[PDB]
Amino acid sequence: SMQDPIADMLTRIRNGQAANKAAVTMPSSKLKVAIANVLKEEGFIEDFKVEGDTKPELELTLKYFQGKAVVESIQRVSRPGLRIYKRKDELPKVMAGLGIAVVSTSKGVMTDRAARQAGLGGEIICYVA
Amino acid sequence: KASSXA
Amino acid sequence: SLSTEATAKIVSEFGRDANDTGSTEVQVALLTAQINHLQGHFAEHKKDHHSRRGLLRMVSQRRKLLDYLKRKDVARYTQLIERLGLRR
RNA sequence: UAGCUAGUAGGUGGGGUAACGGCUCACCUAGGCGACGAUCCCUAGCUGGUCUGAGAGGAUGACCAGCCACACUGGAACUGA
RNA sequence: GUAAAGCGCACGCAGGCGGUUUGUUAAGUCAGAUGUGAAAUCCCCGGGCUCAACCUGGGAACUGCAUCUGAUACUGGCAAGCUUGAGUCUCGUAGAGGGGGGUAGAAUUCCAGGUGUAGCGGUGAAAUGCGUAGAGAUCUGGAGGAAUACCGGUGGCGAAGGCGGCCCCCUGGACGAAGACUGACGCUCAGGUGCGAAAGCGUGGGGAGCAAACAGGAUUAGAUACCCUGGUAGUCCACGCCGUAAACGAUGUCGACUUGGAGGUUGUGCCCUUGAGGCGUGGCUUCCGGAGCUAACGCGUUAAGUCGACCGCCUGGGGAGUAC
RNA sequence: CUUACCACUUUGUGAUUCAUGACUGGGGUGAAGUCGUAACAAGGUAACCGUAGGGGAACCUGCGGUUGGAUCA
Ligand SMILES: [Mg+2]
Ligand SMILES: [Mg+2]
Ligand SMILES: [Mg+2]
Ligand SMILES: [Mg+2]
Ligand SMILES: [Mg+2]
Ligand SMILES: [Mg+2]
Ligand SMILES: [Mg+2]
Ligand SMILES: [Mg+2]
Ligand SMILES: [Mg+2]
Ligand SMILES: [Mg+2]
Ligand SMILES: [Mg+2]
Ligand SMILES: [Mg+2]
Ligand SMILES: [Mg+2]
Ligand SMILES: [Mg+2]
Ligand SMILES: [Mg+2]
Ligand SMILES: [Mg+2]
Structure with a gap:
């Protein structure tokens, strides 16, 4: 279901x-x-x-x-079957940068750029480019 | 398999 | 399967009202009654495997509801099984 | 290999050790372990590291350094910090 | 799907996974700080042996571990909800869905008798076989088993295997229409349990037709076959057993999203039902074809497209689905 | 001296594992062997699957199932 x-x-x-x-x-x-x-x-x-x-x-x-x-591609990273969390240094960079990675953090659902700047990480929801 | 020998 | 009046009774015996036809306890009894009734059908016949399938589905279903309710209101659970004389 | 377990799992009190402890003993409880793999089989010193690999991995534990174990085979204690 | 690979089909404990809102927790998760992560090694930059190998100072590294302090989106725990998943109720529809008991009409075979007279049967052609002891044909009568022509469908129902004369009894599921009710009760499922064509096995019945085995006649170089004349187990019933099939869509289950056309079948709403009808809204089921996918063939809203959850399975041909 | 613990060792009976064994089963590999020609085309009886019976051998035949059958049947 x-x-x-x-x-x-x-x-x-x-x-x-x-x-x-x-x-x-x-x-x-x-x-x-x-x-x-x-x-x-x-x-x-x-x-x-x-x-x-x-x-x-x-x-x-x-x-x-x-x-x-506009959305060239979009794929689910973290899954209910397999949860993916990464740390600040370790946050991904889709398309060498020119593409994003949606991450959930204890200060909210932000860009990978955003979390990186905000000096934090969390469950990475998905890539979009 | 297998005439003059062989 | 089950008599319109007969079902209708069981509704107004385990439900918070008639029309409370979907209550957890109600649903359990309607099955239990039917189950107990088909008992005699499969007393003779026996080879009626297609029908027996329906029976097992009813037992299975009944089992998934009771377990749901044990998990919510045990008091209702403990009572419902004594009240239908089953579960052991 | 699907069951395993009598000092067995816990307790109480005695004894015992440098020391905690079924470590030991008497009694009372009937527990304890296991599909998160007990049990029983096979193989094996562990690590820092070594080799390979872009990496993740795979392979490996000579030589150096740390830890453990052994000293013809099985067993026991005595001396002693 | 066809290369190796979806369990024949389901039910379902453990496990994995889990709709939607708030509060609460802070386990997962993220942040910081402080400890420790021996030296050697690898790396960086230097220094020393004539160089190099080698030796060596310092650094980086040791991506780890633990603890303390915070964070609270997501995940989990707990509280309380919600109605869209799921289920209950009411009324109806179609159907070889199942179990049990009746019954009917065609036809075959046999038994008895009438008529009748020299052939019948069979094949490519023949013969074995049956007929003058009267066959074949034909008429009347009787016994008996099995299967259900037409309807019939590109059909229907069933989890699969499968289910076709007609009638009753017992009984399972499906779909639709409105609502009302329950309030995540769900999806998947190792192990487990259950069902499971045909052949086969046990006991007892039954035995018309058909027919492994077997026999005879043919064919042929041979013919342990194909063909012909015969013919037993079996095919049938009860009860138990077996558990396999190219059990096939060679395609696991559940859910979501993504252009179209033409059929089948079964519901249901609306149009002076105007009468062949018309436009809607479901269910099940086929044919064709776009994107896309694919090695290709091809699949294509019943995906082999785009995604998620769980399961089963594959890892060169053979040896072997064999041995232990 | 005696008691407890306990090593060698002893007795009975099992379990497992390695080696080996007259004989025996199939498997594999070895240019032209013998017997037939089963499959591939409609392979000259379409083939194949499960099962059963039979036969020097491929195979044949029965029951059901498959298309992974060729044809204006
Ligand atoms: Mg004590
Ligand atoms: Mg003491
Ligand atoms: Mg060793
Ligand atoms: Mg690898
Ligand atoms: Mg020694
Ligand atoms: Mg001393
Ligand atoms: Mg294949
Ligand atoms: Mg299948
Ligand atoms: Mg170091
Ligand atoms: Mg929460
Ligand atoms: Mg029999
Ligand atoms: Mg099989
Ligand atoms: Mg098409
Ligand atoms: Mg075998
Ligand atoms: Mg041939
Ligand atoms: Mg042939």
Whole structure:
């Protein structure tokens, strides 16, 4: 049955982007948003939107460019089957830098750049480039 | 397998 | 499978009201009744393996509910098993 | 190799050691271990390091240095810090 | 999927994994600090032997461990929730789904009798075989077992294996429609248990047709076969057993996301139901094809596409799925 | 002197493991051997799978299953 919403979110993006979908919706969550936040804040999506009362509904509007989408690739790193945490020195660098790695820290869900600067690390959620 | 010998 | 009135009784015996048809205790009894009833069907017949499958599903199901409830309200658990005369 | 365990697991009190302790002994409890692999088989000194490998790994424990064990084979104590 | 590789099919304890909100905890996780991580070695920069090997000062390194102090996103523990996963209820639909008991009509075979007269049967052609002791054909009657033509479908139901005349009894699941109720009760599953074609095995029945074995006639160089005439176990029933199949989609289960077209079947909503009908909304099931995937063939919303959770399995051909 | 502990050793019976053994089972490897020609084409009886029976040998035959069968059947 369904055992990882974060992973699904990422693939939902990945299939949406592929399908030239203008936007993508899904059941929302606290953590699901924090990711949208980093995604918008770092410019991979136009913006988030949470239209819900009892059943939150996270909507994402995709970005495109030349003739191709913006999110080149996005893959779940840490998993429910295999948790991945890294320290400050050890935080990853997707695409030699020109790409991000979403990490959860005791001061919140930030860029790898961000956590690095903030001198801390934590569960690394996913790569996006 | 196996004529003149062999 | 089970008589409309008969089910209806069991609803208003283990539920907080009739219409409380989905209560954990209720669900257990409806099975238990049916289980106990099919007991005689498989008293003769025996070779009816396809039907017996349904029976086991009912026992399995019943087992996953009771364990759920032991885990929530033991008091309700301890009572429900004495109240249906089972579990040992 | 799926069971293993009588000083066995704990306790109490005596004894005992440089010292804590079933270390030992008497009694009372009936415990203790194991699928996170006990038990029983096979093989083996451990480490710093060595060799290889981009790395993770794989292989290895001569020579140097640390630790352990042994001294013809089995066993025992005496002397003594 | 076809190269080695998805257990024949499920149920399910342990394990792994786990929707959504808040509080709380601070185990995981992250931060800092302080201890320690022998020297040698590797590395860096120097110095000394004529150089080098070698020797050597200092440093870096020892990516580890422990402790103390903080952090609280995520994970876990605990509290209390929530309704979208899951399940219960009501009413209906289709169906060779299962178990048990009846019963019917075609046909084969045999038994008895009538008519009848020289052939029948069989093959490529023949013969064995059956017929003048009357066969074959034909009519009447009777006994008996097995299977269910047409319907029939590119069909339906079942976890799989599988289930086709008709009727009743007992009984399992599925789907739809509205809601109401329960409030994460879930997914996967080593081990375990259960089901499991056909053949086969045990006991007792039954035995028409069919037919391993076997016999006879043919064929052939031979013919331990193919073919012909015969024909027993078996095929049938009960009860127990076996546990394997190219048990195949050679494709594990569950969930999510991702252009289209044409069928089948079973529901259900709406249009003066106007009458062939029309547009919607489910379930199951086929054909074709885009991206994408693929070594290719091909798969393609019933993926072999894009992802996650758990399981089973593969590691050159053979030896061998054999031996112990 | 005597008691406890205890080494050698002794007795019975098992377990395992190594070596070996008349004879025996298949397996592997060795240019042209003998017998047939089973498979590959519709391989001249489509092939193959499980099972059963039979036969110098491949194999044959029965029951069900598969397409990984060629053909205007
Ligand atoms: Mg004492
Ligand atoms: Mg004392
Ligand atoms: Mg040794
Ligand atoms: Mg490697
Ligand atoms: Mg000695
Ligand atoms: Mg002394
Ligand atoms: Mg294969
Ligand atoms: Mg299968
Ligand atoms: Mg050092
Ligand atoms: Mg928490
Ligand atoms: Mg029999
Ligand atoms: Mg098999
Ligand atoms: Mg196609
Ligand atoms: Mg074997
Ligand atoms: Mg041939
Ligand atoms: Mg042939």
